[PDB]
């Protein structure tokens, strides 16, 4: 598949490898950083991140209107809206 | 349920 | 200015809003996962259990587990967890400054309704609240006061005929057959083809699967031959790490159970004899109304169908010269929350609730007598 | 106050010391140990009772390799440590002489790998809380670490809790997949088949070829032939072709100093450049008990964790260790994923009747700018934590329990 | 055999053991591991005496697995390979097995309970096509469980090699929703005591090792009764560890292992599946039965298949059946406990109850022609024939 | 199996 290198040597000090190699080109003493701040941001991104993979993803609260909206398709030929409203039952037993 | 069905 | 809040709690799903909106304003499952590793990324975020959405989202490395099941609350510190999360953390509103109408359904333990109003004023400290029936909230949305109710929600399915707002409380009929049970039984007819699942976060996948794909068939004796002579029915369904599925006949066999519940092994009738027993309960003048007003409701009532299969049903039950129309409107599956918000904001209703001095006079045993 | 916690990373071929809260380890040194050593008869608990204070006359770490007069062993093997008396004496230096801790004011936080014996965790228990007294003590997996030592080099956004991290040192490599911060114990896979491996193999073939490799340095030799000019090739037999017809270019060559007289002697680095690093995919070469590639048992540490956590942990397979650092090695092993993954999709797609097309499972491997070190910054980061002083084993807990405190590990079960 | 001279041949075809033989007999005629090797070579293993084919099945494929690569032809009860499961068949009706012309012959097979129709649909068409059998049933394995003990009534719990189930039957009336399917059984035991045993430095890695690590699991491994107590011998004590003496000539250690690796029936949560012991199952497929069941179906609790062959299974089922009893019938009422009337059936022939089962059934119905699947009813419909068993395929 | 487990 991919070609290889021939010519590629990383030769570095025992003590230079304990920290890192020439195979990866950012590998070796980091610049020192604040790791609560880090953890924190980590901490908040995946959070973010979830929010959004549960937003993409199938949604059971989907069909109660508002914000969800409304599950429509589902109506039938026969269904009739809550908005129609019958008459009161009149049998002839009714009047007089 | 306590007798009948679990619930 | 205080409005009251409007919660469901029902099996399956709670809805929670605003007394005097048109759509609750907050929807999640009602699970409780408890994490089933041992994480020791500590500091990430860890908790000891994930309610509602937050479980979901998870659902791969927790154990969900509903607190409600048939209706009836079997565990009260999850539901307990579940109320904490729908007050303070989807509403975002104190508890202790506005009045709770919660919903139940009919014919549970009274123990369940004691447990409720105990802990919604010793634990929230509610300044009042109140317990309506759901069937009755499904008819005030729908604005009628004539008709039996058909509501069938996650866990529960059951039939509440009214006539002119007077209630028949000897002919309210209960059925422990819905959602969960129809998940349940398509989980298992899932087998035949080959797909095994089986861990309480894959019921979930199978609950997506029957409330995307499943239909109510008009004819079953007929559809199941037209499954069998053609292709011509089946739908793929891909899984969330890449298996695709394909079930062509297990679509209306899911809900075919609401209509012969033998299927489940259960003695009980169908949803339709359900509803017709519980219309002949009733007075001989009052049924021509009963039958034109049959209104549907709940979740397990949004399947592509349904409507015109209750019809042939109730039609070939039903004498000749009797009109039958099913009233399903697509905004059904909340129509229980929307009653609920109708009632909350009403006038005459300021007298009804049951009031902290109420509970402090007569403890728990007070809401039997004020709530119907 | 308090002062910071002290992180111990012990590992088979090299140990990473420092106080956390830092970026960095402040030592790492080999894991070696020079003691004084000569030629007596008897048991080994017998001959080591030394008379006098002379149980205190030897060095560790880059001290010990230099003497050439004490004899240097290495007192843990396959991540398992073999020897106790060495490691108490090693542990005691490490706490007395580098990190200068009076281990009576800081928590410490040691690693392990995977399949650590239960007793190994006791004996360790009852040296570092009847011997050197600390406070609490934390004996986390090593690879669930090294997760957390790749957010400092991948855009802000899109550092994930989730990931299979493949954690390959000096003695043993292992697969421990993370899902949401919660360790998939059940599915974590050990394999004793590591550097040294690679090493002993390597020194393995330049004996049975190369002439002028003085014996004392054979080994030091072959690691600078295999961290120096080794590779990963994309076919096995395509590339002893390669080196066959065009020797010229293919054939390195490899100058050392024997440190007896100073002279150079000089070696052909060969095949050697791509067998080093096959026993990754080949396990065979190196341990006939295994025989398989190490991108499939990656595949079936993720086809055995949960369904709707698979998509993502393909997603962020995060590389760890020493041994990894090989120049194309996450390309292989996401090739060889992807094609595994690709054909179970088509597959799947097929026997579904082919109405759908799934989305295509995204393979990626992300190799950081900390993985010589990744675990030791992750300890960092975990015993810098407030709720660190809530998970540790505190002295009250030892005291009234015994060392039966540290038996359970995320492997097992109850 | 029947009146027309046609024999009547019982197959079982388990996933972990093949056990076949004749109607009406006592005992399967011959009972084999149901694994098809092909021959390899490795550096570790020296052999140049035994004639090794390039095909080995049954039983000499697994007593010569040290110079072959073995896989088993089937999985869960579902057939992953269709050309080892011809192969073994082919082996299984052959020269060196049971003997028959299967021209000829009537068939007597078996499958678990919800199992995937297309399973049994090309295991009839693979009986009627290739072999060509005048009849062909496939009967259940909980009916023929408790036709072999002689009851009409029972809770059958058949933990095979590879899949238990749990399948209640009353007075003769099969109830298939209370049919229980747990996916744990001989196999995954022997793979958590493989993940053991590698936590002690012994590595079992080839496919000939896993009968090893099988053979290990069946001479020394047993059920505890108490697990606390078990644990505290396991910790306390040195009176668990044994030895075991490997083909090659190494000698292992087994220690606490030995009740760790059976636990994972009861306490499924050790290999990562997510569900109930098979106690606490079988406890819950009882109290979903109707109420005037229960107290019949606790005292005919038939144990079956060899994976409940554990030095005291029995036992420590009664013990968990009663605790749960005492927990959540009886609410914590010590008193009536001694009311509490189990009866765990194990009989000692209970590794090949099925077979047993099969065999009665076939002595019963081999003369009859509305009980047999025929093979001109095949030709004539195809797979649905099976329609005449009661399961309605099209 | 063919979907879920593997048989
Ligand atoms: N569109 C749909 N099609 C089929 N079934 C549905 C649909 N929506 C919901 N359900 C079923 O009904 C249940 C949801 O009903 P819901 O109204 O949420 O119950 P509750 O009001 O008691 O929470 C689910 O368990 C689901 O199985
Ligand atoms: N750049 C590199 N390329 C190849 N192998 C390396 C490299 N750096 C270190 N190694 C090997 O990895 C081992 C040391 O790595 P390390 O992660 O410290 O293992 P451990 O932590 O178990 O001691 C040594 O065996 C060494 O030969
Ligand atoms: N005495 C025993 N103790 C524990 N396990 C056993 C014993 N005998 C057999 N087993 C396990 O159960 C399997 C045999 O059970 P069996 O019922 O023959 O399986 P099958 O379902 O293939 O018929 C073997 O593969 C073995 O792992
Ligand atoms: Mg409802
Ligand atoms: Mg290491
Ligand atoms: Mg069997």
């Given at each position: 598949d991919?070609?290889?290198?021939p010519?590629?040597?990383?030769?570095?000090?025992?003590?230079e490898?304990?920290?890192?190699?020439?195979?990866?080109?950012?590998s070796?003493?980091?610049?020192?950083?604040?790791?609560?701040?880090?953890?924190?941001?980590?901490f908040?991104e995946?959070?973010?991140?979830?929010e959004k993979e549960?937003?993409?993803?199938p949604?059971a609260?989907?069909?109660?209107?508002?914000?969800?909206?409304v599950?429509?398709?589902?109506?039938?030929?026969?269904?009739?809206?809550?908005?129609?409203?019958?008459?009161?039952?009149?049998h002839?037993?009714?009047?007089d | 349920?306590?007798?009948?069905?679990?619930? | 200015?205080?409005?009251?809040?409007?919660?469901?709690?029902?099996?399956?799903?709670?809805?929670?809003?605003?007394?005097?909106?048109?759509?609750?304003?907050?929807?999640?499952?009602?699970?409780?996962?408890?994490?089933?590793?041992?994480?020791?990324?500590v500091?990430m975020?860890?908790k000891?259990?994930?309610?509602?959405?937050?479980?979901?989202?998870?659902?791969?490395?927790?154990?969900?587990?509903?607190?409600?099941?048939?209706?009836?609350?079997?565990?009260?510190?999850?539901?307990?967890?579940?109320?904490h999360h729908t007050?303070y953390?989807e509403?975002?509103?104190?508890?202790?400054?506005?009045?709770?109408?919660l919903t139940?359904?009919?014919?549970?333990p009274?123990?369940?309704?004691?447990?409720?109003?105990?802990?919604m004023?010793?634990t929230?400290?509610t300044?009042?609240?109140?317990?309506?029936?759901?069937?009755?909230?499904?008819?005030?949305?729908?604005?009628?006061?004539?008709?039996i109710?058909?509501?069938s929600?996650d866990?529960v399915?059951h039939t509440?005929?009214?006539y002119?707002?007077?209630?028949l409380?000897?002919?309210?009929?209960?059925?422990?057959?819905?959602?969960?049970?129809?998940?349940?039984?398509?989980?298992?007819?899932?087998?035949?083809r080959?797909?095994?699942f089986?861990?309480?976060?894959?019921?979930?996948?199978?609950?997506?699967?029957?409330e995307?794909?499943?239909?109510?068939?008009?004819?079953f004796?007929?559809?199941?031959?037209?499954?069998?002579?053609?292709?011509s029915?089946?739908?793929?369904?891909?899984?969330?790490?890449?298996?695709?599925?394909?079930?062509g006949?297990?679509?209306?066999?899911?809900?075919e159970?609401?209509?012969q519940?033998?299927?489940?092994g259960?003695?009980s009738?169908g949803?339709?004899?359900?509803?017709?027993?519980?219309?002949?309960?009733?007075?001989?003048?009052?049924?021509?109304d009963?039958?034109?007003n049959?209104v549907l409701?709940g979740?397990?009532?949004?399947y592509?169908?349904?409507?015109?299969?209750?019809?042939k049903?109730?039609?070939?039950?039903?004498?000749?010269?009797?009109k039958?129309?099913?009233?399903?409107?697509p905004?059904r599956?909340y129509?229980?929350?929307?009653?609920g918000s109708?009632?909350?904001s009403?006038?005459?209703?300021?007298?009804?609730?049951?009031?902290?001095?109420?509970?402090?006079?007569?403890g728990?045993?007070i809401?039997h007598?004020?709530?119907? | 106050?308090?002062?910071?916690?002290?992180?111990?990373?012990?590992?088979t071929?090299?140990?990473?010391?420092?106080?956390?809260?830092?970026?960095?380890?402040?030592f790492?040194?080999?894991?070696c140990?020079?003691?004084?050593?000569?030629?007596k008869?008897?048991?080994?608990?017998?001959?080591?009772?030394?008379?006098?204070?002379?149980?205190?006359?030897?060095?560790?770490?880059?001290?010990?390799?230099?003497?050439?007069?004490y004899?240097?062993?290495?007192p843990?093997?396959?991540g398992?440590?073999e020897?106790?008396?060495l490691?108490?004496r090693?542990?005691e230096?490490?706490?007395?002489?580098?990190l200068?801790?009076?281990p009576?004011?800081?928590?410490?936080?040691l690693?392990?790998?995977?399949?650590?014996?239960?007793?190994?965790?006791?004996?360790?228990?009852?040296?570092?809380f009847?011997?050197?007294?600390?406070?609490?003590?934390?004996?986390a997996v090593q690879?669930?670490?090294?997760?957390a030592?790749?957010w400092?080099?991948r855009?802000?956004g899109?550092?994930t809790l989730?990931?299979?991290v493949?954690?390959?040192?000096?003695?043993?490599?292992?697969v421990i997949?993370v899902?949401?911060?919660?360790?998939?114990?059940?599915?974590?896979?050990?394999?004793?088949?590591?550097?040294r491996?690679?090493?002993?193999?390597?020194?393995?073939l330049?004996?049975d070829?190369?002439?002028g490799?003085?014996?004392?340095q054979?080994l030091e030799?072959?690691?600078?032939?295999?961290?120096?000019?080794?590779?990963?090739?994309?076919?096995?037999?395509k590339?002893?072709?390669?080196?066959?017809?065009?020797?010229?270019?293919?054939?390195?060559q490899?100058?050392?100093?024997?440190?007896?007289?100073?002279?150079?002697?000089?070696?052909?680095?060969?095949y050697?450049?791509?067998?080093?690093?096959?026993?990754?995919?080949h396990?065979?070469?190196?341990?006939?008990?295994?025989?398989?590639?190490?991108?499939?048992?990656?595949?079936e540490?993720?086809?055995?964790?949960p369904?709707?956590?698979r998509?993502?942990?393909?997603?962020?397979?995060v590389?760890?260790?020493?041994?990894?650092?090989?120049?194309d090695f996450?390309?292989?092993?996401?090739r060889?994923?992807?094609?595994?993954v690709?054909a179970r999709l088509?597959?799947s797609?097929?026997?579904?009747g082919?109405?759908?097309?799934?989305?295509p499972?995204d393979?990626?491997?992300?190799?950081?700018?900390?993985?010589?070190?990744?675990?030791?910054?992750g300890?960092?980061?975990?015993?810098?934590?407030?709720?660190?002083?809530?998970?540790?084993?505190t002295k009250?807990?030892?005291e009234?329990?015994?060392?039966?405190?540290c038996?359970?590990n995320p492997?097992?079960?109850? | 055999?029947?009146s027309?001279?046609?024999?009547?041949?019982?197959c079982?075809?388990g996933?972990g053991f093949?056990?076949?033989?004749y109607?009406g007999?006592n005992?399967?005629?011959?009972?084999?591991?149901?694994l098809?090797?092909?021959?390899?070579?490795?550096?570790?293993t020296?052999?140049?005496?035994?004639?090794?084919?390039?095909?080995?099945?049954?039983?000499?494929?697994?007593?010569?697995?040290?110079?072959?690569?073995?896989?088993?032809?089937?999985?869960?009860g579902?057939?992953?390979?269709?050309?080892?499961?011809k192969?073994?068949?082919?082996?299984?009706?052959?020269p060196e097995k049971?003997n028959?012309?299967?021209?000829?012959?009537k068939i007597?097979?078996?499958?678990?309970?919800?199992?995937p129709?297309?399973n049994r649909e090309?295991?009839?068409?693979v009986?009627?096509?290739?072999?060509?059998?005048?009849?062909?049933?496939?009967?259940?394995?909980?009916?023929?469980?408790?036709?072999?003990?002689?009851?009409?009534?029972?809770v059958?719990?058949?933990?095979?090699?590879?899949?238990?189930?749990?399948c209640?039957?009353?007075?003769?009336?099969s109830?298939?929703h209370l049919?229980?399917?747990?996916?744990?059984?001989?196999?995954?035991?022997?793979?958590?005591?493989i993940?053991?045993?590698?936590?002690?430095?012994?590595?079992?890695?080839?496919s000939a090792?896993?009968?090893t690590?099988?053979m290990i699991?069946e001479?020394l491994?047993?059920?505890?009764?108490?697990?606390?107590?078990?644990?505290?011998?396991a910790?306390?004590?040195?009176?668990?560890?044994?030895?075991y003496?490997?083909?090659?000539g190494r000698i292992?250690?087994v220690?606490?292992?030995?009740?760790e690796?059976?636990?994972?029936?009861?306490?499924?949560?050790?290999?990562?599946?997510?569900?109930?012991?098979?106690?606490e199952?079988?406890?819950?497929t009882?109290?979903?039965?109707?109420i005037d069941?229960?107290?019949?179906?606790?005292?005919?609790?038939?144990?079956?298949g060899?994976?409940?062959?554990?030095?005291?299974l029995?036992?420590?089922?009664?013990?968990?059946?009663?605790?749960?009893?005492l927990?959540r019938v009886?609410?914590?009422?010590?008193?009536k406990?001694?009311?509490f009337?189990?009866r765990?059936?194990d009989?000692?022939?209970?590794?090949?109850?099925?077979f047993?089962?099969?065999?009665?059934?076939?002595?019963?119905?081999?003369?009859?022609?509305?009980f047999?699947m025929?093979?001109?009813?095949?030709?004539?419909?195809?797979?649905?024939?099976?329609?005449?068993?009661?399961?309605?395929?099209?």
């Amino acid at each position: 598949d991919w070609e290889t290198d021939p010519d590629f040597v990383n030769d570095v000090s025992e003590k230079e490898q304990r920290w890192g190699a020439k195979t990866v080109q950012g590998s070796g003493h980091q610049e020192h950083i604040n790791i609560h701040k880090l953890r924190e941001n980590v901490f908040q991104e995946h959070q973010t991140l979830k929010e959004k993979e549960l937003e993409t993803g199938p949604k059971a609260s989907h069909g109660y209107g508002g914000k969800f909206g409304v599950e429509q398709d589902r109506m039938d030929r026969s269904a009739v809206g809550h908005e129609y409203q019958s008459k009161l039952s009149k049998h002839c037993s009714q009047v007089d | 349920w306590x007798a009948x069905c679990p619930a | 200015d205080i409005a009251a809040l409007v919660v469901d709690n029902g099996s399956g799903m709670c809805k929670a809003g605003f007394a005097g909106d048109d759509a609750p304003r907050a929807v999640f499952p009602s699970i409780v996962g408890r994490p089933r590793h041992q994480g020791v990324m500590v500091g990430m975020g860890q908790k000891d259990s994930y309610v509602g959405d937050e479980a979901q989202s998870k659902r791969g490395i927790l154990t969900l587990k509903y607190p409600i099941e048939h209706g009836i609350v079997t565990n009260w510190d999850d539901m307990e967890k579940i109320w904490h999360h729908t007050f303070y953390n989807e509403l975002r509103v104190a508890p202790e400054e506005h009045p709770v109408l919660l919903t139940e359904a009919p014919l549970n333990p009274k123990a369940n309704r004691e447990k409720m109003t105990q802990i919604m004023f010793e634990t929230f400290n509610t300044p009042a609240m109140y317990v309506a029936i759901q069937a009755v909230l499904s008819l005030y949305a729908s604005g009628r006061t004539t008709g039996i109710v058909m509501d069938s929600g996650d866990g529960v399915t059951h039939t509440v005929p009214i006539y002119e707002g007077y209630a028949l409380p000897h002919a309210i009929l209960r059925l422990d057959l819905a959602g969960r049970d129809l998940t349940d039984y398509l989980m298992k007819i899932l087998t035949e083809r080959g797909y095994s699942f089986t861990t309480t976060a894959e019921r979930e996948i199978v609950r997506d699967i029957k409330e995307k794909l499943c239909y109510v068939a008009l004819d079953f004796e007929q559809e199941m031959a037209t499954a069998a002579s053609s292709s011509s029915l089946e739908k793929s369904y891909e899984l969330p790490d890449g298996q695709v599925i394909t079930i062509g006949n297990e679509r209306f066999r899911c809900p075919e159970a609401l209509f012969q519940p033998s299927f489940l092994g259960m003695e009980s009738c169908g949803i339709h004899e359900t509803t017709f027993n519980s219309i002949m309960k009733c007075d001989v003048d009052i049924r021509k109304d009963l039958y034109a007003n049959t209104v549907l409701s709940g979740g397990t009532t949004m399947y592509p169908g349904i409507a015109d299969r209750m019809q042939k049903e109730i039609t070939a039950l039903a004498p000749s010269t009797m009109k039958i129309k099913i009233i399903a409107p697509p905004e059904r599956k909340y129509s229980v929350w929307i009653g609920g918000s109708i009632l909350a904001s009403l006038s005459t209703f300021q007298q009804m609730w049951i009031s902290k001095q109420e509970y402090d006079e007569s403890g728990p045993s007070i809401v039997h007598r004020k709530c119907f | 106050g308090r002062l910071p916690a002290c992180v111990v990373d012990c590992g088979t071929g090299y140990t990473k010391l420092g106080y956390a809260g830092n970026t960095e380890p402040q030592f790492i040194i080999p894991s070696c140990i020079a003691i004084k050593e000569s030629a007596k008869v008897g048991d080994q608990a017998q001959r080591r009772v030394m008379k006098g204070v002379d149980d205190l006359d030897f060095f560790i770490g880059d001290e010990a390799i230099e003497k050439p007069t004490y004899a240097t062993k290495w007192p843990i093997r396959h991540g398992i440590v073999e020897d106790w008396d060495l490691m108490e004496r090693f542990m005691e230096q490490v706490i007395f002489k580098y990190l200068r801790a009076e281990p009576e004011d800081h928590y410490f936080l040691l690693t392990e790998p995977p399949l650590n014996t239960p007793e190994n965790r006791e004996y360790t228990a009852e040296i570092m809380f009847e011997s050197f007294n600390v406070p609490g003590l934390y004996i986390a997996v090593q690879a669930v670490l090294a997760l957390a030592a790749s957010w400092t080099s991948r855009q802000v956004g899109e550092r994930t809790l989730t990931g299979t991290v493949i954690d390959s040192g000096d003695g043993v490599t292992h697969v421990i997949p993370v899902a949401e911060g919660y360790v998939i114990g059940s599915c974590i896979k050990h394999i004793p088949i590591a550097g040294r491996d690679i090493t002993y193999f390597i020194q393995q073939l330049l004996r049975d070829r190369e002439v002028g490799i003085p014996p004392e340095q054979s080994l030091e030799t072959a690691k600078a032939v295999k961290e120096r000019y080794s590779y990963v090739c994309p076919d096995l037999v395509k590339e002893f072709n390669k080196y066959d017809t065009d020797g010229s270019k293919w054939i390195k060559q490899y100058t050392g100093i024997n440190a007896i007289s100073k002279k150079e002697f000089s070696i052909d680095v060969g095949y050697e450049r791509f067998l080093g690093p096959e026993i990754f995919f080949h396990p065979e070469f190196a341990n006939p008990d295994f025989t398989q590639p190490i991108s499939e048992v990656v595949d079936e540490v993720i086809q055995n964790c949960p369904i709707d956590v698979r998509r993502p942990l393909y997603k962020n397979i995060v590389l760890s260790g020493g041994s990894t650092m090989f120049r194309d090695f996450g390309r292989r092993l996401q090739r060889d994923l992807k094609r595994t993954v690709d054909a179970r999709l088509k597959l799947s797609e097929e026997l579904s009747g082919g109405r759908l097309k799934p989305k295509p499972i995204d393979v990626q491997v992300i190799t950081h700018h900390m993985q010589r070190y990744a675990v030791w910054f992750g300890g960092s980061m975990l015993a810098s934590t407030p709720e660190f002083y809530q998970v540790c084993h505190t002295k009250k807990d030892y005291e009234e329990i015994g060392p039966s405190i540290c038996r359970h590990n995320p492997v097992f079960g109850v | 055999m029947d009146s027309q001279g046609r024999k009547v041949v019982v197959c079982d075809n388990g996933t972990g053991f093949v056990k076949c033989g004749y109607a009406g007999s006592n005992f399967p005629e011959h009972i084999f591991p149901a694994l098809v090797g092909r021959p390899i070579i490795r550096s570790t293993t020296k052999v140049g005496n035994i004639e090794i084919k390039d095909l080995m099945v049954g039983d000499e494929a697994s007593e010569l697995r040290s110079m072959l690569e073995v896989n088993y032809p089937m999985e869960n009860g579902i057939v992953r390979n269709w050309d080892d499961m011809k192969h073994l068949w082919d082996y299984t009706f052959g020269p060196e097995k049971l003997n028959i012309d299967t021209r000829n012959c009537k068939i007597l097979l078996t499958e678990p309970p919800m199992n995937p129709t297309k399973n049994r649909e090309k295991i009839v068409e693979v009986m009627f096509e290739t072999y060509q059998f005048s009849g062909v049933y496939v009967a259940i394995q909980a009916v023929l469980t408790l036709y072999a003990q002689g009851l009409l009534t029972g809770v059958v719990v058949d933990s095979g090699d590879g899949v238990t189930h749990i399948c209640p039957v009353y007075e003769g009336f099969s109830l298939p929703h209370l049919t229980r399917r747990l996916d744990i059984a001989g196999r995954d035991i022997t793979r958590y005591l493989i993940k053991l045993l590698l936590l002690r430095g012994y590595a079992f890695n080839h496919s000939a090792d896993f009968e090893t690590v099988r053979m290990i699991k069946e001479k020394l491994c047993y059920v505890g009764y108490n697990i606390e107590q078990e644990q505290k011998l396991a910790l306390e004590t040195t009176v668990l560890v044994e030895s075991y003496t490997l083909p090659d000539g190494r000698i292992i250690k087994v220690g606490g292992e030995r009740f760790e690796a059976p636990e994972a029936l009861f306490q499924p949560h050790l290999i990562n599946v997510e569900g109930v012991g098979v106690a606490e199952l079988l406890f819950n497929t009882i109290q979903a039965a109707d109420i005037d069941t229960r107290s019949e179906f606790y005292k005919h609790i038939v144990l079956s298949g060899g994976s409940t062959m554990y030095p005291g299974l029995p036992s420590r089922l009664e013990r968990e059946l009663k605790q749960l009893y005492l927990e959540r019938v009886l609410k914590g009422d010590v008193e009536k406990l001694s009311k509490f009337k189990i009866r765990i059936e194990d009989p000692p022939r209970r590794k090949h109850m099925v077979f047993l089962g099969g065999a009665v059934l076939a002595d019963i119905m081999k003369d009859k022609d509305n009980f047999w699947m025929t093979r001109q009813e095949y030709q004539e419909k195809g797979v649905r024939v099976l329609e005449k068993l009661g399961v309605t395929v099209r």
